[PDB]
Amino acid sequence: SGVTVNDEVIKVFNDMKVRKSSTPEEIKKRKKAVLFCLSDDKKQIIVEEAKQILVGDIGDTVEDPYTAFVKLLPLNDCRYALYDATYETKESKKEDLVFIFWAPESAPLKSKMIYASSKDAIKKKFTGIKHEWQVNGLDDIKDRSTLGEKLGGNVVVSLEGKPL
Amino acid sequence: SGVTVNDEVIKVFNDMKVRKSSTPEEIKKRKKAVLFCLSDDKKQIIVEEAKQILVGDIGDTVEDPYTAFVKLLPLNDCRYALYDATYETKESKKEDLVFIFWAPESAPLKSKMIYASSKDAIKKKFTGIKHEWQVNGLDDIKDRSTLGEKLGGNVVVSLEGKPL
Amino acid sequence: TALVCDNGSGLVKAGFAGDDAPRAVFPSIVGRPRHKDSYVGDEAQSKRGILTLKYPIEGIITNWDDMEKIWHHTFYNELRVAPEEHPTLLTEAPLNPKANREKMTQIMFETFNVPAMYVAIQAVLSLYASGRTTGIVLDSGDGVTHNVPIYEGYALPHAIMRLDLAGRDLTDYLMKILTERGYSFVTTAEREIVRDIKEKLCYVALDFENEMATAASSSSLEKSYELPDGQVITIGNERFRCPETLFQPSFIGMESAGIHETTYNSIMKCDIDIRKDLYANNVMSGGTTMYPGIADRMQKEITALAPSTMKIKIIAPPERKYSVWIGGSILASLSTFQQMWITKQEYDEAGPSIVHRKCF
Amino acid sequence: TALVCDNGSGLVKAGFAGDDAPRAVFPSIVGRPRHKDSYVGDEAQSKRGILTLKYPIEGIITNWDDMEKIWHHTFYNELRVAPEEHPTLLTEAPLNPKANREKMTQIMFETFNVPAMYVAIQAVLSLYASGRTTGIVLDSGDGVTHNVPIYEGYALPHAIMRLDLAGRDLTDYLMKILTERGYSFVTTAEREIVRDIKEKLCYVALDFENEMATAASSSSLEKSYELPDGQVITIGNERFRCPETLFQPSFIGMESAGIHETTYNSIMKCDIDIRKDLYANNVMSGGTTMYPGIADRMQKEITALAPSTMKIKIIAPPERKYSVWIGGSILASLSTFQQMWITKQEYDEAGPSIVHRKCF
Amino acid sequence: TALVCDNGSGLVKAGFAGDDAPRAVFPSIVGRPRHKDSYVGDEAQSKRGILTLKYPIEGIITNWDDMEKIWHHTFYNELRVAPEEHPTLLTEAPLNPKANREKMTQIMFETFNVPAMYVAIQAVLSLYASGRTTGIVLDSGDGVTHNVPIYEGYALPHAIMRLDLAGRDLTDYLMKILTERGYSFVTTAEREIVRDIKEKLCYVALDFENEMATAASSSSLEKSYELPDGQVITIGNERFRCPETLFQPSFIGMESAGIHETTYNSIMKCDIDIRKDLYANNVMSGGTTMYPGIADRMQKEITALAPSTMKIKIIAPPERKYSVWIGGSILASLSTFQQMWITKQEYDEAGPSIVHRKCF
Ligand SMILES: Nc1ncnc2c1ncn2[C@@H]1O[C@H](COP(=O)(O)OP(=O)(O)O)[C@@H](O)[C@H]1O
Ligand SMILES: Nc1ncnc2c1ncn2[C@@H]1O[C@H](COP(=O)(O)OP(=O)(O)O)[C@@H](O)[C@H]1O
Ligand SMILES: Nc1ncnc2c1ncn2[C@@H]1O[C@H](COP(=O)(O)OP(=O)(O)O)[C@@H](O)[C@H]1O
Ligand SMILES: [Mg+2]
Ligand SMILES: [Mg+2]
Ligand SMILES: [Mg+2]
């Protein structure tokens, strides 16, 4: 139903889904969180230019990789996002990546309709992504416990190094 | 709205609704049809004295238990009645008992009003009676097929041993 | 004389032993008002807009305070005989737990004060009344559908399949596909009329694609039904689209196997040496196997699953609607059955534990 | 440029794609004289004492000789553009049969000669225009009320509830409870005035007993309306007694569940793992969810039914009256939607069967 | 760095060597639609009503076109590292045929292009991680239950018992005995919930008759579980009636010996001089030995079979669920293990025959 995804998006997804042997410099240039947006004439999903969190910027400029991800998202417009989560369950220590469909209630209808019909066109190209999470209100994403609610519910015990 | 039912009526109803182990003499003294009337001062529903059909009088003095029931009813006055019907449906052979509210169009209004307001006071005391049938004109009760019309409509195939 | 009270999933069948058909056939419903205390059977089906309807046998007895109402309505208001002077046979579903078989015996002796009773299995009496002691019994009732494989008079409990698709979910699907035409059936009294359209005008398609492609061009298919107020509704290709739900349960949205594959997965779960005497002896029963063309469709669909050297035979007797009841009316009217029963003295000297010993 | 013609149950909404609101809003009525041959839309609402009024979409299209009239009146007399030069999006109700979706495509290409068309679902466009792809959509129109649960952009067809209580039966109840005061509204032109009292002065009571007990003593409640001839009628406690019929259908005499319980029995009919993302995403639409205080009453009544650990959230967007139309005006004014449409050449090489393939 | 991919019967455990627990735990399922081409692991467990589920390790690898899918899903979508830059340890079941051990080595070097690999035995790594080299290993997984007697680091192949009763057949029995209460679990997503009731609330009865006679009168036993939609189901005496199937397989209808008698008939099949150092060193592992009270029941039931002068001891380590994986994560993170591996150059100069020589 309309929009196609650009090939620069799929290259950013293949830098996150399959990691590979890396120097200590290059493993600090992998992406912990990425925002995907729409182009000016609204025909293609593109990687947004200066809204991303690198793995190497955690513990210095970014104190916490989740509290500094909620601040990227605009409150009057819609986005896709892609977050590489680090969580420990009761028996196992895991690491999976989460597809976030951000569409706040304060956004205009021409930016809420055009991503809801284009979501299936960018999910199909993202092979093997398990955790979908649509988010509308700020209050549903702002807290740390509401990510661990989608990921395991009651079996998560430590999300991004901090206990729940 | 007025009249109560006498306790000699409820004893006659419990002799018909639940039958029990009987000698061949006593099973010929169960009641196939009973008429209930009003007392002289019109305060109580009583069992009418000599208008009833016994099961033991069928096939001898009473040739047919339904044609000899229509002849009991008075054409210028109103009655309740209580008829133990014997009917075979398409798949099953049944036996249930029918409450008849007889109120002809030729009766006076002081005998038509006083049973219509007292019907709910004698139906409530008759637990589990399924087939209510108000009758006004003679032509609606006289035929055999108009009892089988209330009982099953088109699924009755033999009423009182005779085919329809 | 003996009473035979079949504890149906959606219809209590009850009558006196030695009769060909049950005297009383009424729904397994106890209705209570939203805001007399409780209405039972046909009374709760007649009243409208004021009752909430509950089922105590929705095939295993769930509520024993509601089941006592159902049986009190059977003996007094429908059979019309006192229970303390008549011995009372009862029936239980396959895979009924051992505690539920003792509570069924305690109610008859302590509440209703029966002189004697007996409890039989609903699948075994269906197979004995088709002249067999070995054969797989498809018992498709109102609320539950069982496949019970029986070898030499004993049902194999690990192999008994249970499907929760049954004839009640075909009524509530026939109210949806007749809403497509425009007949807005929605009330409780307009559910009984849809259930009477289902008996008289439905049939199972021999092949669904070639029947539904014939349903567009042909005029033979289309029937006309007459409602209780004399209006005439015209049913078309909803005649075979309704009982085809039993063979494709994806129509009613569940992922379960059809009745031609829960039958096959109950023969394959039995021991290897006895499967050939279950393939050649499929026996059907219950109200929902009464459709015409269902013995011809079960043979076709099981043959397409089963290996090619096995003989697939479906036996449909013509009185299979009441075969569980008729088998209990013959067996309790035998003169040599009189020492088989559990008497009230045997309850007083052994409690509810007697039922396992003598009603095995 | 593209036409978006929403096939409403009681109001045809139609306009050009890219506009914020429909150009044409008119009733779904074809009127014929009792003894010009047929009057359509506002003409049959204006004439009095001489016409018999018929509805072809009384939510599923019943009469295709009357529906061709409705659409001929939309393109020429109300939109005011020729249909052969403009592509025409259309909408269909949930649970629309497959034969009715082909006849809707055959009329556009053979009668009106459209260059291209598309057919969408009315519940899905309501959910996409609230920024969601998963959520239960309460679509309460004039003639029908649907609950459509949608999980990942696909409506679950076995779980779609349909209630036949809707905003048209609230107009014909408001003419009864204003007859209690003494305002004898009875004509066809006095039904439109009652329908305009309903929009401007009705509201849903938060608790009916404490509002109706306050309605006896308080003077805040009582409003004054001014009729087309300048007379002043005074409405009292008929402001909240009218839309309370949606929550208690026993007022209008039917036994059906209210809109706070057909919503609950549509979440409970969905699979066990996805019910928590339907409880927290109830989305409303249609003209009859426009009452103030109905998002605050739906949250209270569903919370009293639902288990206590589930988060019940009702989302009411402020333009929910036309959200099915606005969602089809954005989606057909996209420049990248131009290859999505069904062209006239694709009809000529595949017949009406094309609609299932490209308008899924 | 090294990958350790345990080829589980019902759960693939996979992680990086040196971690305490596996990163990826997902089912051994490849699902295909009835009528993307194939869904693997958690995707085929999530989808409903449309897939047919197949297992390639239903403990010996049956289908190599489905097993390549499982391993492609482990490296890329769950571990998240490319296989050509990481050496890959694998595990095989006891009594794995010699041709299946060569095809497992050919896929890693020719399809996935690993730089090095190694294949170990699942029973030997369980015994070494309990600080022993001699002892009988009860490895009770999802799909198969093995008793492997090991004397001085070498499993005795004629004495290895295999029981086909395992933890998967306890899930499909717990859906039957909770159907007795009335909780009609039947769908694929309602099988995972029953499998999570089994982990958290089941336990092995110390004596079955005195526990089940206490279960009628006592209120301590009865627990309450909360479903994904917040409904509360109450489980009673189905807590100990489920894992008692392992000690009495006649409950699930098979004639096989229990796990306290396949253990005994594996010690009696070993040589006469070494049986005393197997009686005193029973070691357990796998997911299905995690029940509380099963080390106290295995000691009681083996002591009743074994002669009276022998010391019967059951060793249950607390992390025995993943002991086959943890033993392969220690052994592949050793710095002195770096010349043990089979390199890609050794495959190019000796074909698949290398695996017998270096992975003995
Ligand atoms: N001729 C028929 N065709 C199809 N269904 C029928 C027919 N007669 C009865 N039924 C159905 O069979 C069901 C009752 O069967 P029954 O065996 O008595 O069920 P149960 O014992 O589970 O109460 C009802 O759903 C009824 O509508
Ligand atoms: N503000 C309002 N308050 C209450 N009902 C309203 C309001 N505005 C419109 N309606 C009603 O909504 C109905 C029309 O809604 P609509 O969604 O267009 O229906 P349909 O699509 O079924 O034709 C009419 O019954 C109308 O009276
Ligand atoms: N705490 C537990 N209690 C009982 N069974 C458990 C427990 N945890 C896991 N299981 C079961 O163990 C099985 C998985 O064990 P596993 O050793 O991984 O099997 P496999 O290697 O054969 O795939 C599953 O049937 C699972 O339900
Ligand atoms: Mg039955
Ligand atoms: Mg609408
Ligand atoms: Mg294992």
Residue owning tokens 């490296």: E75
CA of D11 to the centre of ligand 2 (A): 8
Picking from E229, E256, E283, the residue at the C-terminal end of a domain is: E256
Nearest residue (CA) to ligand 2, atom 21: D8
Burial class of residue E360 in the structure, from the number of CB atoms within 10 Å of its CB (0-12 exposed, 13-18 middle, 19+ buried): exposed
Q: Which amino acid is at C228?
A: P
Inter-chain residue contact E77 with A127, CB threshold 8 Å: yes
Q: At what angle do helices D64-72 and D98-110 cross, to 10 degrees?
A: 50
Only one residue has tokens 């069992």, namely: B47
DSSP symbols for C127-186? HHTTT-SSEEEEEE-SS-EEEEEEETTEE-TTT-EEES--THHHHHHHHHHTTTTT----
How many other C-beta atoms lie within 10 A of the C-beta of residue D196?
Answer: 14
Among the candidates E226, E256, E286, a domain finishes at E256
Q: Are D110 and D123 in contact (CB under 8 A)?
A: no
Tell which of C256, C279, C297 closes a domain: C256
Q: Does D282 touch chain A (CB under 8 A)?
A: no
Q: Which atom of ligand 2 is nearest to the CA of D170?
A: 25
E279 and E140 in a common domain:
yes
**Residue D32 is encoded by which pair of tokens?**
């014929």
Q: What is the CA radius of gyration of chain B?
A: 16
Task: Please spell the DSSP secondary structure of chain A, one letter per residue.
Answer: --PEEPHHHHHHHHHHHSB----TTGGGSSEEEEEEEE-TTSSEEEEEEEEEEEGGGBTTTBS-TTHHHHTTS-TTS-EEEEEEEEEEESS-EEEEEEEEEE--TTS-HHHHHHHHTTHHHHHTTSTT--EEEEE-STHHHHSSHHHHHHHTTTSEEEETTEE-
Q: Which two tokens stand for residue C211?
A: 């029947």
Token pair in block for residue C289: 């196997």
Please tell me the distance between residue E159's alpha carbon and the centre of ligand 6 in angstroms: 19
CA of D53, closest CA in chain A: separation in Å? 37
Pairing status of strand D88-92 against strand D3-6: parallel
Domain co-membership, C184 together with C278: no
| Structural domain boundaries enclosing C148 | 123-164+257-323
Q: Where are the alpha helices (DSSP H) in chain C?
A: 42-46, 64-72, 98-110, 122-128, 168-177, 189-201, 208-217, 264-267, 276-279, 295-303, 323-331, 344-348, 354-358
Angle, CA of C166, C169 and C174, to the nearest 5°: 125
Asked if residue D249 lies in contact with residue D256, where contact means CB atoms within 8 angstroms, the answer is: yes
Look at chain C and report how many structural domains it folds into.
Answer: 3
**Nearest partner of D324 among D127, D189, D89, judged by Cα:** D127
The rounded distance, in Å, linking the Cα atoms of E40 and E28 is 8
- Residue D41 Cα distances to D14, D23, D67, D78, D199, angstroms: 13, 15, 11, 10, 20
CB of C12 closer than 8 Å to CB of C41: yes
Alpha carbons E327 and E91: distance in angstroms, whole number: 11
Rg (chain C; Cα; Å): 21
Say if residues B115 and B101 touch (Cβ distance below 8 Å).
Answer: yes
> Residue E210 in 3-state DSSP?
helix
Nearby residues of C219 by Cβ (< 8 Å), 6 or more positions away:
none
State the burial class of residue E29 (Cβ atoms within 10 Å of its Cβ: 0-12, 13-18, 19+).
Answer: buried
3-class DSSP assignment, residue D19: coil
Evaluate whether E136 touches E148 at the Cβ level (below 8 Å): yes
What would the DSSP string read from start to end of E128-184? Answer: HTTT-SSEEEEEE-SS-EEEEEEETTEE-TTT-EEES--THHHHHHHHHHTTTTT--
- The Cα of D294 is separated from the nearest Cα of chain E by a number of Å equal to 25
What's the distance, Cα to Cα, between the start and end of chain A in Å?
A: 40
- Beta-carbon contacts of D189 under 8 Å, excluding residues fewer than 6 positions away, are D46, D48
CATH class of A1-164: alpha beta
CB contact under 8 A, C164 and E182: no
Given its phi and psi angles, is residue D95 left (phi above 0), alpha (psi -120 to 50 degrees) or beta?
Answer: left
| C145: nearest Cα among C125, C161, C129 | C161
d(CA C294, ligand 1 centre) in Å: 14
Of the candidates E268, E18, E58, the residue with the CA atom closest to the CA atom of residue E143: E58
Residue D89: name the closest of D357, D334, D348, D351 by CA.
D334
- Burial of residue D34 (CB within 10 Å: 0-12, 13-18, 19+) is exposed
Comparing CA positions, the residue from A45, A48, A104, A116 lying closest to residue A78 is A104
Rounded to whole angstroms, the Cα distance separating C320 from C327 reads: 11
CB contact under 8 A, E85 and A128: no
**Burial of B2 from C-beta contacts in 10 A (0-12 / 13-18 / 19+):** exposed
Same domain, D346 and D283: no
The distance from CA C358 to its chain's CA centroid, rounded to whole angstroms, is: 25
Q: Write out the two tokens for A59.
A: 């513990």
Residue B47: count of CB within 10 angstroms of its CB: 19
Q: Could you tell me which residues are beta bridge partners of residue D150? A: D135, D155
Q: Are E122 and E129 in contact (CB under 8 A)?
A: no
Q: Is the dihedral of CA C63, C69, C73, C75 positive or negative?
A: positive
Local structure of residue D54 (DSSP, 8 states)? E
E230 touches chain D (CB under 8 A): yes
- Phi, psi (rounded to 5 degrees) for C299: -70, -35
Would you call A20 and E19 a contact, using CB atoms and an 8 Å cutoff?
no
Q: Are E259 and E298 in contact (CB under 8 A)?
A: yes
CA distance D14 to D79: 7
C-beta of residue A136 within 8 angstroms of C-beta of residue D280: no
Q: Please identify, by atom number, the ligand 3 atom nearest to the C-alpha of residue E195.
A: 27
- Spatial distance between the Cα atoms of D101 and D352, rounded to a whole number of angstroms: 9
What single-letter DSSP state applies at residue D188?
S
Contact D158 C252 (CB under 8 A): yes
E46, E187, E231 member nearest D307 (Cβ):
E231
- Kindly give the interhelix angle for D168-177 and D189-201, rounded to the nearest 10 degrees: 100
Q: Is D60 close to C180, i.e. CB distance below 8 A? A: yes
The DSSP secondary-structure symbol of D40 reads: E
Q: Is-contact C6 C13, C-beta < 8 A? A: yes
Same domain? D45 vs D68: yes
Between CA C171 and CA C288 the distance in angstroms is 11
Whether the CB-CB separation of C223 and C234 falls below 8 Å is answered with: yes
Which residues sit directly before a break in chain E (C to N > 2.5 Å)?
35, 58
Strands B156-159 and B79-89: antiparallel
One domain for residues C294 and C343: no
What are the contacts of D316-320 at 24+ separation with CB within 8 A?
A: D316/D284, D316/D289, D317/A105, D317/D129, D317/D130, D317/D283, D317/D284, D319/A109, D320/D126, D320/D284, D320/D285, D320/D286, D320/D289, D320/D290
CA distance D9 to chain C (A): 14
Residues B92 and C22 sit within 8 Å (Cβ to Cβ): yes
CB contact under 8 A, B18 and C82: yes
* Contact residues, chain D, for E232 at CB < 8 Å: 307
Is chain A touching chain B, with at least 3 CB–CB pairs below 8 Å?
no
d(CA C321, CA C332): 19
Long-range contacts of residues C307-313, Cβ cutoff 8 Å, at least 24 apart: C310/C275, C310/C276, C310/C279, C310/C280, C311/C276, C311/C279, C311/C280, C312/C279, C312/C280, C312/C282, C313/C279, C313/C280, C313/C281, C313/C282
C-beta of residue C100 within 8 angstroms of C-beta of residue C60: yes
The number of helix segments (H) and strand segments (E) in chain C equals 13, 17
With H, G, I as helix, E, B as strand and everything else as coil, classify residue D135. strand
CA–CA dist A57, A64 (Å, integer): 10
Residues D116, D83: contact at Cβ < 8 Å? no
For E144, the token pair is 């198969």
Task: Return the bridge partners of C120, or none.
Answer: C91
Which H/E stretch holds residue D201?
A: helix D189-201
| Method used experimentally | cryo-EM
Q: Is E153 exposed, middle or buried (0-12, 13-18, 19+ CB in 10 A)?
A: exposed
What spacing in Å lies between the alpha carbon of C14 and ligand 1's midpoint?
15
Question: Tokens at residue E104, please?
Answer: 């497992």
Resolution given for this structure, in angstroms? 3.8
Tokens representing residue C160 in the block: 């008994």
Residues with C-beta less than 6 Å from any ligand 2 atom: D 8-11, 141-143, 167-168, 195, 198-199, 286-288, 290-291
CB D14 within 8 A of CB D5: yes
CA–CA distance, C186 with D256 (Å, rounded to integer)? 8
CA C284 to chain centroid, in Å, comes to 11
Taking the C-alpha atoms of residue E118 and residue E360, their distance in angstroms, rounded to an integer, is: 10
Please answer whether residues D311 and D279 qualify as being in contact, where contact means their C-beta atoms are separated by less than 8 angstroms.
yes
SS3 E27: strand
Q: A16: nearest CA in chain E?
A: E80
Domain with residue E203: its CATH number is 3.90.640.10
Q: To test ligand 2's pocket by mutation, which of D11, D13, D122 has the most ligand atoms within 8 angstroms of CB? A: D11
Question: Are the C-beta atoms of C311 and C328 separated by less than 8 Å?
Answer: no
From chain E, the residues in CB contact with A95 under 8 A are 23, 80
Contact predicate C240/C211, CB 8 Å: yes
3-state SS track over chain B: CCCEECHHHHHHHHHHHCECCCCCCHHHCCEEEEEEEECCCCCEEEEEEEEEEEHHHECCCECCCCHHHHCCCCCCCCEEEEEEEEEEECCCEEEEEEEEEECCCCCCHHHHHHHHCCHHHHHCCCCCCCEEEEECCCHHHHCCHHHHHHHCCCCEEEECCEEC
Q: What is the rounded CA–CA span in Å between residue D248 and residue D255? A: 9
Q: Do D256 and C186 touch (CB under 8 A)?
A: yes
What does DSSP say about strands C232-235 and C51-54: parallel, antiparallel, or unpaired?
Answer: unpaired
**For residue C92, with 0-12 CB atoms within 10 Å meaning exposed, 13-18 middle and 19 or more buried, which class applies?**
buried
Judgement on whether residues D151 and D170 belong to the same structural domain of the protein:
no
Which residues lie closer than 8 Å to C87 by C-beta, 6 or more apart?
C2, C3, C114, C115, C116, C117, C118, C332, C341
Q: What are the sequence ranges of the domains in chain B? A: 1-164
Query: CA Rg, chain A, in Å?
Result: 16
Contacts of D110 (CB under 8 A, 6+ apart): none
Tokens of E297: 């029941």
Contact at 8 Å (CB) between E39 and E31? yes
**Both C156 and C177 in a single domain?**
no
Q: In whole angstroms, how far apart are CA A159 and each of A84, A151, B132, E102?
A: 12, 10, 72, 42
Cβ-based contacts of E190 with chain D (< 8 Å): 272
The two tokens of residue C318 are 């013509």
**DSSP state at residue E306:** S
Which of D320, D295, D261 minimizes the C-alpha distance to D139?
D320
D192 and D297 in one domain? no
Other C-beta atoms closer than 10 Å to the C-beta of E309 total 6
Instruction: Compare CB distances from D129 to A4, A109, A134 and report the shortest one's residue.
Output: A109
Nearest CA-CA distance, residue B162 and chain C, Å: 19
* Distance (Å) from the alpha carbon of E10 to chain D's nearest alpha carbon: 22
Of C21, C42, C321, Cβ closest to residue B130: C42
Beta carbons within 10 angstroms of residue C35's beta carbon: 4
The binding-site residues of ligand 1, defined as CB within 6 angstroms of any ligand atom, are C 8-11, 141-143, 167-168, 195, 198-199, 286-288, 290-291
CA of D12 to the centre of ligand 5 (A): 9
Q: At what angle do helices E64-72 and E98-110 cross, to 10 degrees?
A: 50
Asked if C161 and C266 touch (Cβ cutoff 8 Å), the reply is: yes
Q: What is the largest CA-CA distance in chain B?
A: 49
- CA–centroid distance, E288 to ligand 6, in Å, is 9
Structure tokens at E328: 């392969």
Between the CA atoms of C330, C332, C333 and C339, what dihedral angle is there, to the nearest 10 degrees? 140
DSSP-derived 3-state class of residue C248: coil
How many CB atoms neighbour CB A61 within 10 A?
Answer: 10
- Tell me the β-bridge partners of D128: none
